[PDB]
């Protein structure tokens, strides 16, 4: 529970690791993966060994490659 503005949707997880916003179009192949478009806030919750983190999007969860996304919240100044 951070300190500030608390505006999150019901389909979004109350708790998560960090926040990310898709920058490129990524069409999932199987339900296992996640499909999103350039401009989707994916709440990262898990991060596999390789570039693959698990997050919830529009209620639908799925694994996506940590390449078509860009970190906007974290220790990285950007």
From Swiss-Prot:
It comes from Homo sapiens (Human). It is linked to There is evidence, including phenotypic data from ABI2-knockout mice, that loss-of-function variants in ABI2 may play a role in autosomal recessive intellectual disability. Residues 15-72 form the SH3 domain. The SH3 domain is critical for binding to ABL1 and ABL2. Regulator of actin cytoskeleton dynamics underlying cell motility and adhesion. Functions as a component of the WAVE complex, which activates actin nucleating machinery Arp2/3 to drive lamellipodia formation. Acts as a regulator and substrate of nonreceptor tyrosine kinases ABL1 and ABL2 involved in processes linked to cell growth and differentiation. Positively regulates ABL1-mediated phosphorylation of ENAH, which is required for proper polymerization of nucleated actin filaments at the leading edge. Contributes to the regulation of actin assembly at the tips of neuron projections. It is found in: Cytoplasm; Nucleus. Component of the WAVE complex composed of ABI2, CYFIP1 or CYFIP2, BRK1, NCKAP1 and WASF1/WAVE1. Within the complex, a heterodimer containing NCKAP1 and CYFIP1 interacts with a heterotrimer formed by WAVE1, ABI2 and BRK1. CYFIP2 binds to activated RAC1 which causes the complex to dissociate, releasing activated WASF1. Interacts (via SH3 domain) with ABL1 and ABL2. The gene is ABI2. It comes from the Eukaryota. The chain holds residues 444 to 508 of 513 of the full protein. Belongs to the ABI family. Widely expressed. Abundant in testes, ovary, thymus, and colon, with lower but detectable levels in prostate, peripheral blood leukocytes, and spleen. Phosphorylated by ABL1. This is Abl interactor 2.
């Amino acid at each position: 529970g951070s300190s500030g503005s608390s505006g999150d949707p019901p389909w979004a997880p109350r708790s998560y690791l960090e926040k990310v916003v898709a920058i490129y179009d990524y069409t999932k192949d199987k339900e296992d993966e996640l499909s999103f478009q350039e401009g989707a806030i994916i709440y990262v919750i898990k991060k596999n060994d390789d570039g693959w983190y698990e997050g919830v999007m529009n209620g639908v969860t799925g694994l996506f490659p940590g390449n078509y996304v860009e970190s906007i919240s974290g220790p990285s100044s950007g």
